[PDB]
Specification:
Strand content of chain A: 25-35%
Oligomer: homotrimer
GO molecular function, one term (chains A, B, C): identical protein binding
Distance between the termini of chain A: 61 Å
Keywords: Respiratory Syncytial Virus, Prefusion, Vaccine, viral protein
Largest sheet of chain A: 13 strands, mixed
Radius of gyration of chain A: 30 Å
Protein name (chains A, B, C): Fusion glycoprotein F0
Family (chains A, B, C): Belongs to the paramyxoviruses fusion glycoprotein family.
Largest interface: A-B, 56 and 52 residues
Number of helices of chain A: 9
Number of domains of chain A: 2
PDB class: viral protein
Chain lengths: ~450, ~450, ~450
């Protein structure tokens, strides 16, 4: 549980090390069941307000079912199509005429029962709401009369809460075309999810992990609507399987590196691209460019490999030797020098240029460091905030070791007269190759 | 209902054809009404818990009205300003002193009634919640006493549900500055919306369409807050009018096209830009660059022309002849060769470069295709998933015809020594013009 | 309250002036308290449905507390870490064993009381929900029996509403890792927030401002979960402090400026970058590049300085003299000429190129202006909508003065043969310097 940060002065970048991986590589699918009541509208002599409250709920219930049935025949398309084929496969099995009865019968005596789908692709089925049993046990005998009979209020509220979960579930499937992510607590109770985690083909270690990061598991799960057939409402919930565990992860931070010439329009800049999370995965490195695809629970990084590029392990060389032959490190160039700061795990990178007031302060002691023009780094030890111009940033107070790797800023190795100063995506090699070829045109002349 | 896909090996792009359009070109505006009760706080001898529950709800009701009245006098600005002038126009008419009474009186006997606004811009008005009638019929006679009289519980809950819809409506207008999109089910019941679709100046064909894509209609509608005046809460709901129907739409997919030289830093790449949806519209083509502005209901593409650029129909030529004189096809160049895949409607494009393990598998049969370095395509027939490195993608299982257009990759037509290898937005012509001009500098020397 | 717009024909950009600032520079922190009941599950002879309804609510209550306690020991990381150190600091103080009792005792007799945290960093503490007092006063004496005693229904519902706020608060902290923004009405009642604004070390002027922009204050606040200890649920709410007030703000709008040659692929374009809001701040200018970081309440611009870059006041010179020596104005070049429009505060910029039908219409009079190829501007006076191709935009109807600054489009000053026509981020100087250096290579030859 030990974090480490290295800051490379030569490239104006920092690496936060010591994290452990939890990369999603597979899916576990479960069928969630809602037993429903098949009742067609029935009109009897009703004036008792209590009977009028049922009529209100009973109609909401009707509309919800029909609205769900209408979402099924409408073939909504989702951007999630690439990630739900394993779950969509289970939905299609449930369509076959045999299969719904096999679930409905397998779940008569319990709330949870393993079921075979005849593939036999075997699922774990859940009954989370039993409105059929409810309506039939306490409601229909009352309103199966020539004149509506008078129920009682406690039964009304017990119904409203039960029905409230239905309506909210339909509302979520409706606005999202039968595919939602994260999986809301209406789709799956925190208790229900923990029960679901306890009955999977994973080690007791993996159960503890998913049980301790319940919130992250939801955010990386999918809920898929299947069918309303034979008094049953079934939807498949797709849960992540983390096949990459305890492999090194590190986060890369970058800031602009510019020369500090006093003259207007005389400065060149470069920045390392591909900031984000890197984790070892199957002899390669999984890179997550997008911010927030990965979730962190202390020391551990939960990511979906679907949001990643695969790079050779040689990519790490860009942090110790950026001019190397093996990997084409990547940079963008410019002449844009605005002061900025990046809050790292254990400190802050500060790129100060021009007349900007860049400083680092301690709440009790005041300013404890003033940054000069250039790219610099400050540990979070004894530091509370960093200020760039009129902007103030809080420094993370996580405990760990910071290592400041001293080195000449590489930007000083370039002749500003021939520098390609507007590259949006260029290797060190492309830039170098490109300067050597432009210097020959001047050589002959 | 027949989809078709063409993959152009020469340009590493694919076109999914056969879709039909439903482009939003106009707006239909309706006034939604909530009859409210004007009651100032009244204190009487009250200890009966039941009377205490009303006091709780009655205060929530008061605060909601005042919070809405305060949102009106505060002149919040929304990014939606460009799209709601037709609805905002109706709100301003309702401000005039005459007009609210004309709605309030026109809706005395019904829940729905067409109204003339004296423009006369004629709207369809809706009463969806009648709290005035309610509070006055069952509540005020009870609490119009020197000592609070004792109501009954069934009336309490009937009030709470009715008031719950109010509070949620105000909450949505509050966090969004009186303009919301989509239109939530609290703003408009699924039943209410279907009733609203049935009373519009559109053909029975257009009614069926909007009735079958209710969820899409919401996501492309706006709800605009107007006034709280004379015991009436009115807001305008803006519904889409699709004036472009049944015109061809196609989606363009692109992937990087690179040379496959074994040498480090010896490879050049290009990619076609402007991936997204194209639909015929009024002799031109409407292009939707942004992902998810358009919504698909099988075979049909629902888009808002407000999120589009207008291009000449000559833009389609970039798919059959990318070097043509008529249209300046567009590409971005680089030397960045990371393996990637794009899931198309009926298959997958795979750009494999370097040491990456790119494959396509069938769930039962295993790997059925291994991709070589370069850009390739695989039909979804007999294919379940595609794998690039450590990343696994599900292939869409939609049925349709795939056509593989064989052709020499255009990247092989360029001399890497003079290639402009860092262009972020360049026509084929700009690149070509630009290579011919750089080859002359070498010609003279 | 007077807005002003200037359109610079020479650069195809417009500036909307006359706005006043309200920039967030500090934070005010308050502790929100929920008194909770410590009751372990108790089983007694219960069949009375009413007693069964408590059991349902009583278990929801239990699960909510444990789910909150589990979020605390799990050390979720949030992207908000940089902005909540002042609030997180208060959470850590509350961890110390002494401190919770000092709050719990300080709030025994009131709902609101100022408290000293022994720093002494003094906070204002709030009790917003008292479930301990409730459960113990009306529930536990009933169910403290050898056989469950029979409660009454009015007490049940009063509990459900009170408990409903708890469950929703936990749900929000759970999905967001104990840090949420905006601060929902479940975290803080509109009444509670206004009460909180009235008890702060700010002038009666600042109170009126925050009280009139309650909705904006929420959207710029944070809610941070602290502890569940000693029958108390405490979370810190972070409220914005606007230290920059009534300083000039202006919004910059830009559109592409292209030549209008009839020949295919003969046209060059440039656009000014850095569109967005600029406000005077401490002798510099705060720039907000991101759309929607800033919120506008009429005439006034609410922004968080955390989302801004700091620029010298010389940046305004890019609107009157874009070739000046003092500031390196910034532009991007291309040969991409698609017609577009930008809706400004008091008008619309229209960049019309090619065969595009660009027009401006009045609802009653029809088309009142047709735009020629080039960049043009139209006031919102007598104008209702602008149309570019198949796209229709509503013009803002705000009242103000528009000034059309005539001038030669700067794009005509460049020789297309040597123009760097694919720059994504380049100063006027870089482009100029760069053309002078490329013209010398032709001079010698």
């Amino acid at each position: 549980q030990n974090i480490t940060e290295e800051f490379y002065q030569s490239t104006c970048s920092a690496v936060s090390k010591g994290y452990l991986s939890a990369l999603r590589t597979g899916w576990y699918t479960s069928v969630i069941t809602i037993e429903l009541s098949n009742i067609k509208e029935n009109k009897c002599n009703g004036t008792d307000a209590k009977v009028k409250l049922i009529k209100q709920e009973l109609d909401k219930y009707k509309n919800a079912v029909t609205e769900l049935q209408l979402l099924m025949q409408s073939t909504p398309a989702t951007g999630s199509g690439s990630a739900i084929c394993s779950g969509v496969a289970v939905c299609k099995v449930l369509h076959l005429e045999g299969e719904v009865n096999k679930i409905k019968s397998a779940l008569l005596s319990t709330n949870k029962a393993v079921v075979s789908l005849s593939n036999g692709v075997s699922v774990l089925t859940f009954k989370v709401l039993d409105l059929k049993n409810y309506i039939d046990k306490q409601l229909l005998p009352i309103l199966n009369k020539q004149s509506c009979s008078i129920s009682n209020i406690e039964t009304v509220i017990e119904f409203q809460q039960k029905n409230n979960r239905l309506l909210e579930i339909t509302r979520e499937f409706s606005v999202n075309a039968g595919v939602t992510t994260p999986v809301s607590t209406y789709m799956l109770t925190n208790s229900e999810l923990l029960s679901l985690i306890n009955d999977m083909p994973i080690t007791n270690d993996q159960k503890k992990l998913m049980s301790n990061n319940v919130q992250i598991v939801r955010q990386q799960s999918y809920s898929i609507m299947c069918i309303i057939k034979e008094e049953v409402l079934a939807y498949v919930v797709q849960l992540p399987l983390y096949g990459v565990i305890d492999t090194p992860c590190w986060k890369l931070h970058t800031s602009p590196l510019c020369t500090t010439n006093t003259k207007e329009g005389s400065n060149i800049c470069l920045t390392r691209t591909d900031r984000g999370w890197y984790c070892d995965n199957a002899g390669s490195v999984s890179f997550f460019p997008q911010a927030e695809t990965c979730k962190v629970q202390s020391n551990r990084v939960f990511c979906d490999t679907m949001n990643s590029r695969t790079l050779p392990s040689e990519v790490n060389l860009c942090n110790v030797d950026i001019f190397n032959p093996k990997y084409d490190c990547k940079i963008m160039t410019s002449k844009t020098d605005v002061s900025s700061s990046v809050i790292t795990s254990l400190g802050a990178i500060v790129s100060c240029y021009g007349k900007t007031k860049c400083t680092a302060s301690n709440k009790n002691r005041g300013i404890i460091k003033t940054f000069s023009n250039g790219c610099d780094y400050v540990s979070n030890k004894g530091v509370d905030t960093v200020s760039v111009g009129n902007t103030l940033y809080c420094v993370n107070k996580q405990e760990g070791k910071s290592l400041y790797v001293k080195g000449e800023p590489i930007i000083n190795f370039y002749d500003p007269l021939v520098f390609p100063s507007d590259e949006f995506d260029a290797s060190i090699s492309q830039v170098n190759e490109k300067i050597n070829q432009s210097l020959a045109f001047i050589r002959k002349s």
